[PDB]
């Protein structure tokens, strides 16, 4: 009859944050100390955090202290777990659990548990971009002008910086705002227009810098 249900979950890159919530049915949380527990991939359970009635005492596993926060909402019956600076070892199924028994005492077991929500922390906090040419052709000519560029794909987090020819080429450069792809990674293109007559008279190199991953890529764009 009593039920709990966790919401939030899924994939987080190392160093990231994720917030979980717990809602309930057929009881009021106000009477109960509420807990978060997790089941790690090796199969064992780990107590994560406890929050007492009226929030007077909040307690945390050593492994998460200073990174996790538990809160409660007694009027609408929710418990929250904020998780920050997440680590691979945080990867687990997370359950909210009530401390309780048929008759309440000063120290009861966990009598009711949610079904769990899976939280996965990927080890890579950063990912350097892949850089592809946007090659000039008759299809990227308009009037006496040619366009060329670099597609800077699949990096995380922002930002990347893009120069052209080590900073010697700045006129006619547009570096677009990044877009978040459904993959969770960023992409942008940097383009430059030049006279069609300058093609073949020099090289064009985009210099891509991704500070967060300490990745630098130079890409030559021809013809």
């Amino acid at each position: 009859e009593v039920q709990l249900v966790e919401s939030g979950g899924g994939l987080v890159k190392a160093g990231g944050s994720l917030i979980l919530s717990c809602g309930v049915s057929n009881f009021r949380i106000s009477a109960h100390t509420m807990n978060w527990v997790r089941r790690v991939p090796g199969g064992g359970l780990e107590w994560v955090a406890s929050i007492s009635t009226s929030s007077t005492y909040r307690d945390y596993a050593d492994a998460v202290k200073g990174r996790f926060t538990v809160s409660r909402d007694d009027l609408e019956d929710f418990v929250y777990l904020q998780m920050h600076k997440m680590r691979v070892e945080d990867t687990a199924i997370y359950y909210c659990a009530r401390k309780g028994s048929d008759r309440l005492s000063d120290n009861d077991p966990f009598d009711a548990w949610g079904p769990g929500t899976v939280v996965t922390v990927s080890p890579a906090s950063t990912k350097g971009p892949s850089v592809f040419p946007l090659a000039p052709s008759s299809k990227s000519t308009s009037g006496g002008t040619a366009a060329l560029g670099c597609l800077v794909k699949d990096y995380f987090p922002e930002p990347v910086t893009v120069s052209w020819n080590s900073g010697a080429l700045t006129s006619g450069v547009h570096t677009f705002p990044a877009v978040l792809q459904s993959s969770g990674l960023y992409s942008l293109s940097s383009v430059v227009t030049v006279p069609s007559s300058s093609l073949g008279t020099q090289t064009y190199i985009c210099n891509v810098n991704h500070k967060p991953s300490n990745t630098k890529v130079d890409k030559k764009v021809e013809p």
């Binding site: 892949s130 592809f132 040419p133 946007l134 090659a135 052709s137 299809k139 990227s140 000519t141 308009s142 009037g143 002008t145 366009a147 560029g149 597609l151 794909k153 547009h174 677009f176 705002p177 990044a178 877009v179 792809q181 992409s187 942008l188 293109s189 383009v191 227009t193």
Partner: protein, 213 residues
């Protein structure tokens, strides 16, 4: 149930101009109206509250007026710092409602986009993905429509757009549209077309290529 209506939604002007932005309420709101300034990627900043009271730190070239159902933000002597979006807001004890925003930009003449298309690189293709890029360059005003057609079948759900901030030298915008296909899907079709509609184009302009040619 209070609805706020802001006009115009885009306002194009020059440095030194005096401009007026209007916000009207669907029912009387006394003087319970605020104005915020917002720059791209930043938080809104409160400028004026109770219709006419400037927040500390706000230069006197901003002024708010009005009461009841009609309110005005006036900026007297536009500076570069003032090009931004302005939002009006009715605020009550337990709710608020905003106007739709007014984006204040630099005025210039209509300029058609120059359109450019880029097939995926052979390098990218090897790794299983095809990004097809259409560039709309140096156009004004910012409103523009791009449609992708693959063997004349209109595409939906598989492209993303990005637009630049207004250019500091020629006051134009540029836009990229990127079509992303699996290599498998890409190799199923021949003609890839970017069709562009813009006020400066008498009829829409299509740039296309044939895969592999």
């Amino acid at each position: 149930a209070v609805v706020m209506t802001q006009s115009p939604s885009t306002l194009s002007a020059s440095v030194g101009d005096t401009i007026t932005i209007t916000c009207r309420a669907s029912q009387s709101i006394e003087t319970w109206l605020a104005w915020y300034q917002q720059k791209p990627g930043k938080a809104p900043k409160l400028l004026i509250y109770k219709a006419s009271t400037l927040k500390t730190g706000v230069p006197s070239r901003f002024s708010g007026s009005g009461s009841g159902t009609e309110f005005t933000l006036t900026i007297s002597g536009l500076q570069f710092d003032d090009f931004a979006t302005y939002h009006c807001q009715h605020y009550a004890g337990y709710s608020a409602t905003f106007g739709q925003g007014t984006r204040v930009e630099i005025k210039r003449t209509v300029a058609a986009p120059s359109v450019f298309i880029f097939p995926p690189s052979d390098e990218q293709l090897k790794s299983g993905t095809a990004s097809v890029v259409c560039l709309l360059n140096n156009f004004y005003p910012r409103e523009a429509k791009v449609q992708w057609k693959v063997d004349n079948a209109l595409q939906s759900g598989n492209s993303q757009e990005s637009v630049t901030e207004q250019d500091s030298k020629d006051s134009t915008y540029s836009l990229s549209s990127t079509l992303t296909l699996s290599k498998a899907d890409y190799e199923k079709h021949k003609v890839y077309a970017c069709e562009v509609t813009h006020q400066g184009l008498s009829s829409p302009v299509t740039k296309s290529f044939n895969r592999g040619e």
